[PDB]
Design a protein around this ligand. Sequence first.
Ligand SMILES: [Cl-]
Ligand SMILES: [Cl-]
Ligand SMILES: [Mn+2]
Ligand SMILES: [Mn+2]
Ligand SMILES: [Mn+2]
Ligand SMILES: [Mn+2]
Ligand SMILES: [Mn+2]
Ligand SMILES: [Mn+2]
Ligand SMILES: [Mn+2]
Ligand SMILES: [Mn+2]
Lengths: 78, 83, 93, 95, 97, 97, 103, 105
Amino acid sequence: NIQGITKPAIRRLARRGGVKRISGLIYEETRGVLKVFLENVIRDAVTYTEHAKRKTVTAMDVVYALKRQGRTLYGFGG
Amino acid sequence: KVLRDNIQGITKPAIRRLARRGGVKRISGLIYEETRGVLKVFLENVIRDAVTYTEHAKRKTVTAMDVVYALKRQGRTLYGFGG
Amino acid sequence: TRKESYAIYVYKVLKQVHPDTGISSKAMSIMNSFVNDVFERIAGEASRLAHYNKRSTITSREIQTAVRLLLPGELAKHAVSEGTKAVTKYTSA
Amino acid sequence: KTRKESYAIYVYKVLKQVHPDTGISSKAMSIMNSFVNDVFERIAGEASRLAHYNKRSTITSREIQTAVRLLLPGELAKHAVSEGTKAVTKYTSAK
Amino acid sequence: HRYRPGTVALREIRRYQKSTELLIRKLPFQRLVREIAQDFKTDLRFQSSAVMALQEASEAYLVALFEDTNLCAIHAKRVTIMPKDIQLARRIRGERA
Amino acid sequence: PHRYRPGTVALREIRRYQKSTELLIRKLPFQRLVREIAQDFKTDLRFQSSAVMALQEASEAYLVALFEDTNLCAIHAKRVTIMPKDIQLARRIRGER
Amino acid sequence: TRSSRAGLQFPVGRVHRLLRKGNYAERVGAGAPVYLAAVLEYLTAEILELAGNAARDNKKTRIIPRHLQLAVRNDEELNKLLGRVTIAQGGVLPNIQSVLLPK
Amino acid sequence: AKTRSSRAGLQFPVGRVHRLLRKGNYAERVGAGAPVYLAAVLEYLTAEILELAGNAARDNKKTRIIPRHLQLAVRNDEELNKLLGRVTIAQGGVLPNIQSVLLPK
DNA sequence: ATCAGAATCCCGGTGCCGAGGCCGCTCAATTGGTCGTAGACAGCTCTAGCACCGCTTAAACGCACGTACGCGCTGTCCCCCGCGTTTTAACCGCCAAGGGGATTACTCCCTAGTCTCCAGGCACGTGTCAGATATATACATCGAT
DNA sequence: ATCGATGTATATATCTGACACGTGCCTGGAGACTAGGGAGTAATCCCCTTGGCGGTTAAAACGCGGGGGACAGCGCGTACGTGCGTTTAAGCGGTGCTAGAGCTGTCTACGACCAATTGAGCGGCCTCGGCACCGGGATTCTGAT
Ligand SMILES: [Cl-]
Ligand SMILES: [Cl-]
Ligand SMILES: [Mn+2]
Ligand SMILES: [Mn+2]
Ligand SMILES: [Mn+2]
Ligand SMILES: [Mn+2]
Ligand SMILES: [Mn+2]
Ligand SMILES: [Mn+2]
Ligand SMILES: [Mn+2]
Ligand SMILES: [Mn+2]
């Protein structure tokens, strides 16, 4: 699952990131990092869904979550 | 009466004292001017805002509250002075 | 003039919790700030929840879920229990 | 089939006002609409505290104004106050 | 022939900063998302836009992060990013403790 | 005579200033500074003495927070001495300008 | 309308509704939906300006998210404003650190 | 009892928390459990903090909680420290922490 | 530089699906209008902000000296990048089924609004003890011999 | 290794003003009542989500081989810490002056609120062209020599 975040995918992100050379241990580190990220965002997201009494997490729950966390995103119904 | 060069009030021993509470042991000589640089951009930010509140409140006196609201604005909330 | 404050309620609770212990003017002030900060933070995020759900009213359901976003775990959990307790207590009485 | 609002058409009209021979994608249109709502909240919000802070019940053009001056960077604020004070006076002309 | 170690790296950087397409293929990511949410609530459904939103937010974030990571690498007279950089980046961001 | 070795009083001073809470910048200089900057934004302003004191409280906190993160950057670079470039990395990463 | 009466393209009505309903204050002045709709109009112009430019520069008649991103990150003042906003399908500006370049 | 505080068995003034929520434009209307809940959560936290401050005061051999005592309290508690991760306490000071590499060998 | 030699760019042809446009309905805006109150504005007092001075001295400045750290060099060893081939599952297109979210009409519980009634909470005053300040003394450790 | 002085730690007594308390005065909450609209609930709908299936096709994987970057060791050169004597201005508390905040008091303009009429704005609609797609030829480098 997590290991579904492939080495090459992580490599591309670092390239768009401006990074030239990548240590082996980075890849796993990236994963914990990404995990923590989604968790917090999805925790907040779901809380919105739980409060909206829905079995379907919407985009707006996500969007509201990212706002909460100061990582505002445009293009999904601001 | 006119006011000039006051940033140099921020003496080197003080910019030192802060760095110590900051856990810094060895301080490069080119640090003291950069710190003043930074402190200035910092005070210019809080006071631009503090003042904008003071202007809105239609006042000639800047209050502890205008300051505190400014900090809150800049995401540097401060307890101890009202609010 | 009247300057309102949580100075009494904070005293009360301090006496309940550390009866041989006093608070300084500044400390009180700080405390007094902390209550107000967390008040807005909570109240605001509740307000967003009403709004997001096309709803005209902030009920303790809001104040609750507000709490679940704002606070960290152990703090949140306890606070929630603590809260929904006094509501229950409040209804009956 | 629910009648969901946006700023889409006005974004367009303004697009024509600045780049008459240019168009837009839906994906970028969302971004423009998001942008509008975000900016609307931030200004409205600031204005709201301003009122409270000053023990007053009304959000006037003045509140909006100073809100703008706290929310915006030196230059962008500057023009904004212009267009703001302009359209208002021009509004108070007509009736 | 053979391109000198690091020269396709530079070439790839150019290619990705020029493009805006997403870099983690959707389905592994999507499966990662559902897994993580299940831990918070059972029997849940996601809007496909809700997953995209997350995806954008996450990648954009990670890229930003590599940017700042990469600066730390450089700060240490290095050219390879290492976990110790990320930790410093995040530490200073105030993300991690 | 007697002479403490280099770095010995630094460590002492750190511990001194980490036990206490009293402001480190002198009171009067500080005020003169703030009155300047504020003048140059709008003339003819007065201050509640507590309002200066607020800005200072807020100022030192920041700089001490700053030095903290500067210090980390020095150490990141296998160094022990803080340098403008360190501060500069902290601020880029904090996302200050 | 009132967009007319203020020379605005932006719905002066819509805005007055939203302020009253979005719980910002008890009462809401007549100038403010106008002042604000204007500032909203002003800023959406500056973006549409520099993005369009960017779409010309990138040789397209239609603005995609990228053109917005380019417009935004390249503008020093706009970029600050949207300092905490990730723009969907924005990508990044091209920037490669010196010491990474070949010798 | 008359005080809504007492009905809820709380130290915090539920009448105050009620007025504030209205003179605050968070919504048209306010429920009646929301003040109660909030007035209580406010209490949990002032208690939770005062507890750790007093302990801080105690170790420093003192009768009276001064802000250092609140500061020590806050930054020693993983969780409280995060709630107030962007906040400054007048006269707080910082936690005694000196980096390894700066210590003599 | 000077070579071929990749890999990338720019170009002309084709092609398809979302832009951008119009069709017409409807619901949000506008109009005309009443009512009262938030806040403008002029009057008045009373806090605290500024100013200015000199006795005191703690802090800051400036220079001298050398120590130990910044950094520049080297030298080794291996951890990543490049690249060719071998292995998985991403993706797309296609249909199928029911969960849940969206919309609608109804009643009743709950909350705003209003009035009269009074102690919780405030300022105000006051008296004393926690804590700050000054000064002597013992304990620890760093660095010099 | 033993020896001395330095700073810190601590013990005392000492003096002071801030917290914490009691008293009394008032404003914000309690109490009791109404009337109205929000929201909750139940009843129908259809849209969106999931699911499962099979085809090419790119992407993941994996390994191989060697190059250059990390990292560790060393040494040079010097900047920054330390200390002392000199120098400057902060902090203290004490006095004097009025500007401006904050509290006050009247009148009315501007906003909310209600109702009735009108087109601005939205979804639904189709056709059409800006642009994604590409196969060939134009260039702009990279590494080898
Ligand atoms: Cl107005
Ligand atoms: Cl409630
Ligand atoms: Mn000036
Ligand atoms: Mn050459
Ligand atoms: Mn072409
Ligand atoms: Mn009034
Ligand atoms: Mn169903
Ligand atoms: Mn020895
Ligand atoms: Mn006057
Ligand atoms: Mn009116």
